[PDB]
Amino acid sequence: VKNSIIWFRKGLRLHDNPALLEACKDAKHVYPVFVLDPHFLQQKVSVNRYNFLLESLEDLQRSFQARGSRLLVLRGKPEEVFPRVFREWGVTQLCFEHDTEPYAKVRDAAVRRLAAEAGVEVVTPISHTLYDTDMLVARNGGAAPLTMQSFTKLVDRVGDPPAPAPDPPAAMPPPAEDMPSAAPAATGVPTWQEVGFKEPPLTVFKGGETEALARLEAAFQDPKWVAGFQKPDTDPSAWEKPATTVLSPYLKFGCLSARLFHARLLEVYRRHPAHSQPPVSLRGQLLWREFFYTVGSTTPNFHRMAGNPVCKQIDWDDNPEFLAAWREARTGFPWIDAIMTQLVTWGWMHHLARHSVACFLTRGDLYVSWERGMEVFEEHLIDQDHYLNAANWMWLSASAFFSQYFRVYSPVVFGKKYDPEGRFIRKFLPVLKDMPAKYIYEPWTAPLEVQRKAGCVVGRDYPAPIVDHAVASKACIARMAAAYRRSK
Ligand SMILES: Cc1cc2nc3c(=O)[nH]c(=O)nc-3n(C[C@H](O)[C@H](O)[C@H](O)COP(=O)(O)OP(=O)(O)OC[C@H]3O[C@@H](n4cnc5c(N)ncnc54)[C@H](O)[C@@H]3O)c2cc1C
Ligand SMILES: [Cl-]
């Protein structure tokens, strides 16, 4: 008989899951498995992103149960767990979605070796990206493109992505009964308290395939908005209704299929001929994700500066003081502190909000290494993606892909163009809620009598600015210019 395992790591969904469809074909029993490490926080990760993962597992649990099955959350390391379950469950096939991350390549190579020793077939379809990224590299002469223009030119020569896979059957082969490793008390989805977190999550975005498909439909309620979408023209200060789709954490964990997203965009584009084109269009935003996945997977040390052949070697500063202020939302610039507060409370910010805090910390004002700011983003973001966090930090620090270091965002004027009353600032910085709009972006300039009336004395209830942007930006621009010549 055929007994199969469908191993979830990413791709936490039932729709467009060819690994799940292969595991179900002719199978007597299917074991849907996610492997959890209960010594993780005993080593980093915020409760916001970890609870997002737990909610996504609870959604899969309810989906498998509605189909007569059950999700199995196995504790331990896959190298130790899978050899045990292969013999206990009589496994003949193991299926999981391909993953191009560095740790995944080393982990999956070991499990593939263990499956071969136990006579288990391994099926690893590609479904996290739009295309087989290795095929895109092979079709471009054996190397990845380093510009969005050349990459968009390649995918148009390749053609459309594969269509999304069909839905799984309405009834699934359940896991076998009375199997000791599949006991319900040891395979259940844990809460955020049981894993060791103390403070509760504060984000407003709930995990799961159900939420992802609901938010996908909500975005497609207005086909004109989708068709004319232009990323640079979107409002970073909108928080009651964000200006972009906010599908990033669902695409990160695989709660939503990029191939399904893409297929729904093409349905709309065929009916709106004046639709926006890449790179600013919504399809172009998926292509940004595909571009960085393709470059990073084929580039060694993509997340670091040393040994990264695409990243410029800049003599970034070792300033723990400046980093702490940026990390703790106490820079003295309300626009920057408000965004850093949205980071630790929501785990998500608009792309141009991320631009402001990243430029400020790196090539704009503080001259702290982009790896340091990434580490802070890797902790709090709920859409934290290995390759995407990297390339955008190297972009904003002007270490790769981007080189216009004379373009420096002002931590005062940038948000004032979108939100002159400071609506966004008052929401995430309630200490400045009574400050008149004329000073809310520059509270140190307000008369003391205005500061006392508004109940916000600079240096007592809100800190003075850590740097003079005019002086700090001039120094940073000169150091970047001198670094671009010694790089040759
Ligand atoms: C310093 C910095 C760090 C970032 N780190 C991450 C990260 O860890 N994870 C992450 O998903 N994105 C990251 N981004 C990219 C981008 O800001 C987010 O993808 C975007 O804010 C998500 O919002 P959305 O889903 O509403 O995007 P939309 O504009 O609605 O785009 C749809 C999808 O396209 C993809 N996408 C959009 N913009 C980009 C981009 N610039 N690069 C790559 N893919 C993109 C995402 O999958 C996104 O969900 C980072 C950007 C910066 C400047
Ligand atoms: Cl600006």
TrEMBL record:
The entry's keywords: FAD, Flavoprotein, Nucleotide-binding
Residues that coordinate or bind FAD: 231, 244-248, 285-292, 348, 351, 354, 383-385, 389, 392
Comp. bias regions, Pro residues: 161-177
GO biological process terms on file: circadian regulation of gene expression; entrainment of circadian clock by photoperiod
GO cellular component: cytoplasm; nucleus
Residue segments, region Disordered: 159-182
Marked site (Electron transfer via tryptophanyl radical) residue numbers: 316, 370, 393
Record-level Gene Ontology MF annotations: deoxyribodipyrimidine photo-lyase activity; DNA binding; FAD binding
Cofactor(s) the protein needs: FAD
Free-text cofactor note: Binds 1 FAD per subunit.
UniProt key word Flavoprotein: yes
Flavoprotein in keyword set: yes
Family: Belongs to the DNA photolyase class-1 family.
Annotated protein name in UniProt: Uncharacterized protein
Organism: Chlamydomonas reinhardtii
Taxonomic path: Eukaryota, Viridiplantae, Chlorophyta, core chlorophytes, Chlorophyceae
